[PDB]
Amino acid sequence: ASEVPQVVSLDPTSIPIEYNTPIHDIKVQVYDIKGGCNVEEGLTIFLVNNPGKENGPVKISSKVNDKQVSEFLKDENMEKFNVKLGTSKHFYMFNDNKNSVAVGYVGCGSVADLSEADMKRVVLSLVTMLHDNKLSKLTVVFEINVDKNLFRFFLETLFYEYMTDERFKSTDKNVNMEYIKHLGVYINNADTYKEEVEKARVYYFGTYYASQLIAAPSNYCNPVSLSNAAVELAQKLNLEYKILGVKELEELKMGAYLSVGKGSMYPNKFIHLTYKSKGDVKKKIALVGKGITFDSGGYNLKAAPGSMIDLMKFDMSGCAAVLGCAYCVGTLKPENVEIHFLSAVCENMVSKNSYRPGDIITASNGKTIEVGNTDAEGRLTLADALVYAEKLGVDYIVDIATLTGAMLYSLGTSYAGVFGNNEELINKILQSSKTSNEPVWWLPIINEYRATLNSKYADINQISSSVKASSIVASLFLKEFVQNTAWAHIDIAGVSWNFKARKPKGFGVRLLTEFVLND
Amino acid sequence: ASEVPQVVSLDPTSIPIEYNTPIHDIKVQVYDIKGGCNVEEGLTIFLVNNPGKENGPVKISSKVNDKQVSEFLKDENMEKFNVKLGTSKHFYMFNDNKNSVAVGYVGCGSVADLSEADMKRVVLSLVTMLHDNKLSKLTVVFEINVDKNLFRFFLETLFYEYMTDERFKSTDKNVNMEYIKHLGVYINNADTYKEEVEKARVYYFGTYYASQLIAAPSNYCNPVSLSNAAVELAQKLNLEYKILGVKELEELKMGAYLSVGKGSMYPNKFIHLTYKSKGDVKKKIALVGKGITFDSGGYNLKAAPGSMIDLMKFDMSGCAAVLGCAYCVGTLKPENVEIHFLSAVCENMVSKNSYRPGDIITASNGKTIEVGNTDAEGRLTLADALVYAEKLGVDYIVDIATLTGAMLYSLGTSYAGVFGNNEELINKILQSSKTSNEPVWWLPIINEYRATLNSKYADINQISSSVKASSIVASLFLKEFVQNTAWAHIDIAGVSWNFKARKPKGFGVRLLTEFVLNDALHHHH
Amino acid sequence: ASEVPQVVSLDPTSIPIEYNTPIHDIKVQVYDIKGGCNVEEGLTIFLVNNPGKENGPVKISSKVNDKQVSEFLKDENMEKFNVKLGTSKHFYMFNDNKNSVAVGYVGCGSVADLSEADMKRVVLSLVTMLHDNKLSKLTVVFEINVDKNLFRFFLETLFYEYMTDERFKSTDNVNMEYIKHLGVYINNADTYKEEVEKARVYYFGTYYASQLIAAPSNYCNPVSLSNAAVELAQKLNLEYKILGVKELEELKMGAYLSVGKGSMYPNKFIHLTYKSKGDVKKKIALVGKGITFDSGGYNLKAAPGSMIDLMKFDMSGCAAVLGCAYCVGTLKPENVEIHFLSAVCENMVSKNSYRPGDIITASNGKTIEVGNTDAEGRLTLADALVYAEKLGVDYIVDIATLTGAMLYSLGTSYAGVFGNNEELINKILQSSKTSNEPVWWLPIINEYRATLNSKYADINQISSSVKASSIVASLFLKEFVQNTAWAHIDIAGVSWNFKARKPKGFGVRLLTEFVLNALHHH
Ligand SMILES: O=C(CNc1ccccc1)N[C@@H](C(=O)NO)c1ccc(-c2cc(F)c(F)c(F)c2)cc1
Ligand SMILES: O=C(CNc1ccccc1)N[C@@H](C(=O)NO)c1ccc(-c2cc(F)c(F)c(F)c2)cc1
Ligand SMILES: O=C(CNc1ccccc1)N[C@@H](C(=O)NO)c1ccc(-c2cc(F)c(F)c(F)c2)cc1
Ligand code: NA
Ligand code: NA
Ligand SMILES: [Zn+2]
Ligand SMILES: [Zn+2]
Ligand SMILES: [Zn+2]
Ligand SMILES: [Zn+2]
Ligand SMILES: [Zn+2]
Ligand SMILES: [Zn+2]
């Protein structure tokens, strides 16, 4: 652990992190629907659809073990309500023991198989029922068909959206915010879904941990404090760790990564965590996250309208996903694998000491690079991280990065893009996207654009002379720093931030963990 | 008081300040017009109107105690000239003692009651007659009706516009500029106006002193040299003074103000001057001035077309007005008041050390603030200054600040905007606007916009997510740092700089002094 | 009624207008709260605050005539909910007769005195519940203190926000049914009863203005809008006159006609008149800016943020004047004569358009140098104001989406009022208070007048140097009013609800309150 430099004594010296969240105190119980539902304290919510009948009526099919509640939920009373996706109603009544109970439903539409986006809308409606209501228990009755992965995603998303991050509130903490202590779930074939519960709780926290790092502003979350947080995480999980400082980075000749950080008051810190299975290692994987804790753009300052310099604390979202994956992997302990979690962390600032547009810098593999724009800093840091990763001798290198704003014009805010030099690895990532329910789309590395990276003076240009397809150009540049290892690159610039809710998504934690686990 | 850091040895280490100005050497005398005007030397100017007759003829009403000059001034010789506001003519003639004299007039229009804008137009025409003419004496004959405040305004405005600031001239000083040594004034009921003369001279210098600080560039006028200047002023006036440095500001937890200054080579300096009357103190007042000695914008750099980064030495105009008020109050010594003159002085710069867009910082009242734009820095420094002010236990807090460029689109360059949480205090400011002749207009604090300052992570956002009425949003933000004290906020971003003349106005010195003096005097007088 | 020109046969030739709305079928009953609440039918919502406990718990005080609902409303249950402004919960349950009812609340915060903005938040929360409701009755129980004007504002806002404009949809909602009954429990119910039918009138005036504003510029053009005004006048038995191009040329309205030169739609000048049956003691002209589409002209709205896609709303001032005509023609005030005026046209790009730099002559003989074809509203108003002053009225009030600078001075909530007469300004401010449509007085600063001095024409249309554009526009308009008390209401910032993507109908209620309460009555 290194000391965080301060300008004034009021500058923070660590990222506040909540490990023991209220979600972790919730006791989860799963019951089979065949035994009927007991309707007692708290709120009991039925998830109901009506296939093929758009905005069709609500009908409750499950057996309910209360005559009063069964009478309330008969078809004649329920048919006045409809299943329109995201719609909900609350019910009040006295049960057979003369206790008042609260019941309701969330509409799940008319399409038998819900997409991750549909299921998220269902969860958001459920969370509105949890907020502003002091409940000790929620019970959820599944009258829809979900596979095991989608059941886990429901739980992960519920936990994540319910959790409210108050680390930076002082005088404006929500004085009414209370969390349930119990969650009941009724589902058909419950025994087959029970193994998903604790996996969902792990995936939730890896994702929420990533969100905590992302949302932490750049005065709290800087290269020293972020690498310190990684050390503490490794200590908690018994992972091996190494933080490389400037002197070691100079010895490794990491000139592209070091140049980006020249202008910052925070020394560069390179994170290397390692998980190794106890048994024979059958696969070795390097996960590389882009870790720019604030991106001002440098001398190519983000001053253009719409460049959103105020959100650029999120430019370490890739590092956060890799560290959240380390939480999940260190918790779940997969066998037969060795995983390296890597991030070349730095901050891109304006200073007398900053690198300049036009500088020619030398990466750790000897390639000279002409810098065309100091705001294309992520690919420079990743170049040196990829050289480092390939020296580890791994089977797969996967990097994840908020690399190019063009991602918003190609895939938008819902799907990440994956690029790579190896179809088998790309297909493994796409399969992990399916089982994590974090959507990714394969995009091409178009070799015809490579000539636009030819530099008159250096071995290569950082940016293209003509091509505006920057996500593809960036991938061509990165490809030059992986010589003979299967490699894939996930550009999460469009999917990292939830603009409607003004908070991170923690995108990539579950994708990467499913990738490690399914291998 | 503190050493000014330098990058090279040629960097200045103090603000040059002229205290003993040529205006202070002018001997002023007021005579009653009923005794007639003696026309002996120099230039004699008649202020003449023609009520109800647009561009009507010049006719001189005064008795003139010279037969030759009286003959020149006959209606018949004056009829080719008219009273159009701001027009002037010069006359040359020999008086009864066979000495050559210069006589003329400035037209005051056809509307009996002159506004501040009209009176300034009259003064500017008079000043053109003083420039490029080596005169030892000016005499002004009021053939128009002015009340006591407008007469004082005439002199203050004359003194201020006549004064030429040459502190930064080296090889291009004006070799021909000579100041008059005598000013004569003829007016009806002269005895009632005589007390306005030395009041005008005090108000002139408070305003010119503020102008000197504003016009001083940011290499001369930085947080250290500006606070050093305030100490020197306090010492000359026998005011109590305290300059708070970074270590004391850290102990007071002023994280909003300190964050703005992080990127500067100049340490933050918080100015606290105090005037206290001898005897019973009936009212305690805090005047808070925005003191950004240069506003680059920070990482939200002022790079957009029209952002005027080259004029941002003027972002301490609020502090300048407060220090000019301290000069006037410390000179005039009102009774029954205790006045605190406050400014959280710093510089908003780009550096490896600067605060960043998105940072969450903690104000001295414990409120966490999400920074949405480093160029909304003034309201961050004022938030901590207002917390400091309220801890003094005052009856009124009035802040004055070049806060929002939106003022140019609401009131423009003539009228300042006042916002506040207390109708009585707002009305006192409006009354002070009337008697100082510095115009201000009351604008609302619209509470419906407060929710757009709600932050997802911090207690409050610095800037709004959707509202473009930035002067109102900034006021809503400042209101969060005043808990239970009458408070008003004067946004002078639009009125501080005279774009036509390329110089400061020193706006607010006379407004704030009139505010203090009118409060020091019981309403029964 | 003039024929609407078409480019293709699919171009619409009228504005669709709904007069009979579901709101008009709601039977409203007001009951005194001191007698307890009948809750056996429909949806019952309690308006609840908690002074002295910020976001504190909900507590319901009223006695209710149903044992099941009384148990739901026990303190132990409602303390699970909080009063944060706009927060709501509602539950369905069976009453003592085993009939389905729904009961809930809207939180009204912790400050006893609600502003109009707070009351809008409460109403929006209520309307969200209504747009998912099929019970035939809503009952609202005021356990908060509201004055008579604010209670009327509650009803108007409830009606306006509840109503959904479906004129341009090709289908029709499976999720709600409009209520047939509205019950209100409030203290002093007898004094609030007279506000109900006034609110219903004010609602439709605002909704009518909203329909004209929201109607797109292919539906709402100078011909179809003046045709709609004629139809309204006929239904209300107002006198009406539409001036066409030949009459406008005879009246020498060169400023207004220049703006419309580039349009395929002929200019149409709307003049409706309400005259009281008794002696006329006061004459008022209401002048609304009626640009049915503002492209900017050759000064095209191409800059970032210029919002050319929303510029069907540049006739919001005309819409407010016509909605006021509906309210005045319906309430029939005494002793007044009201002229409702709008110089209607469209600002387009064409070989026939006026150009930046053109010098045009207004109907009072003043020549104007055009500095920007997108400052077209003040040109149309100049001629409208000359026409208005020739009517010999006591007051001229104009209302207009005139200057974008309003968004930077007062924003989206308060309109600005300017004028040449302090008494008339104070009357407008009082109408703002009793209509609950907020306005703030801004100055006409005479020092800026010299920037309208033109080198060649009598006056410049715009300033080259002064950025206080709302004040400069007021100085320009003031030159077309010679000797009559005049006020100018700039609604450019408040007229469109950006969050809800719909008009506000701002100004109908303000102007009607001015006309109803202008003349003191003893
Ligand atoms: O890609 C570029 C330059 N071309 C470009 C920029 C913006 C839009 C289209 C093209 N610059 C990147 C950078 O600075 N990398 O270091 C960058 C810039 C922006 C975002 C981002 C993230 C978000 F969440 C957004 F919503 C968003 F609009 C943009 C990510 C990376
Ligand atoms: O208000 C903003 C937001 N931008 C903005 C918007 C609309 C118009 C102008 C600026 N930024 C302020 C700031 O940077 N505060 O620190 C600021 C900026 C400019 C002036 C100023 C002073 C003058 F004397 C002027 F003549 C003038 F045009 C502007 C004052 C404060
Ligand atoms: O005033 C100007 C000069 N430009 C300008 C100056 C300062 C700031 C912004 C624009 N242009 C006007 C125009 O072109 N009139 O014809 C105009 C422009 C926009 C809106 C408007 C209406 C709305 F309903 C809004 F919601 C809104 F945000 C803006 C009204 C008038
Ligand atoms: Na962060
Ligand atoms: Na329309
Ligand atoms: Zn970046
Ligand atoms: Zn960048
Ligand atoms: Zn600024
Ligand atoms: Zn500033
Ligand atoms: Zn326009
Ligand atoms: Zn317009």
From Swiss-Prot, chain C:
Its main location: cytoplasm. GO terms for biological process: peptide catabolic process; proteolysis. Its EC number is 3.4.11.1, 3.4.13.-. Belongs to the peptidase M17 family. It comes from the Eukaryota. Residues 299-316 are annotated as: L13 loop. This is Leucine aminopeptidase. Changing residue 448 to A: Loss of catalytic activity and impairs oligomerization. GO terms for molecular function: carboxypeptidase activity; identical protein binding; manganese ion binding; metal ion binding; metalloaminopeptidase activity; metallodipeptidase activity; peptidase activity; zinc ion binding. It is found in: Cytoplasm. Binds 2 Zn(2+) ions per subunit. Two metal binding sites with different affinities are located in the enzyme active site and can be occupied in vitro by different metals. Site 1 binds metal with low affinity and can be occupied by Zn(2+), Mn(2+), Co(2+) or Mg(2+). While Zn(2+) has the highest affinity for site 1, catalytic activity is the highest with Mn(2+) or Co(2+) and less with Mg(2+). Site 2 binds tightly to the metal ion and can be occupied only by Zn(2+) or Co(2+). Homohexamer composed of dimer of trimers. Both the identity and concentration of metal ions available dictate the extent to which oligomerization occurs; Mn(2+) and Co(2+) induces oligomerization, whereas Mg(2+) has no effect, and Zn(2+) causes irreversible protein aggregation in vitro. Optimum pH is 8.5. Active between pH 7 and 11. Optimum pH is 8 for the cleavage of the Cys-Gly dipeptide. Zn(2+) 3 binds at residues 309, 311, 314. Gene3D superfamilies: Leucine Aminopeptidase, subunit E, domain 1, Zn peptidases. Its cofactor is Zn(2+). Changing residue 440 to A: Loss of catalytic activity and impairs oligomerization. The record marks 301 as: Essential for hexamer stabilization. Zn(2+) 2 binds at residues 289, 294, 314, 376. GO terms for cellular component: cytoplasm; cytosol. The active site is at 301, 378. The L13 loop movement regulates the transition between active and inactive conformations by repositioning Lys-301, which, in turn, mediates the rearrangement of the binuclear metal center. Oligomerization is required for catalytic activity and is metal-dependent. The type of metal that binds the 2 metal binding sites influences catalytic activity and substrate specificity. In vitro, activated by Co(2+), Mn(2+), Ni(2+), Mg(2+) and Zn(2+) with decreasing strength. Occupancy of the site 2 is essential and sufficient for activating the enzyme but occupation of the 2 sites is necessary for full catalytic activity. Inhibited by fungal metabolite bestatin. Inhibited by Phe-Naphthyl (PNAP).
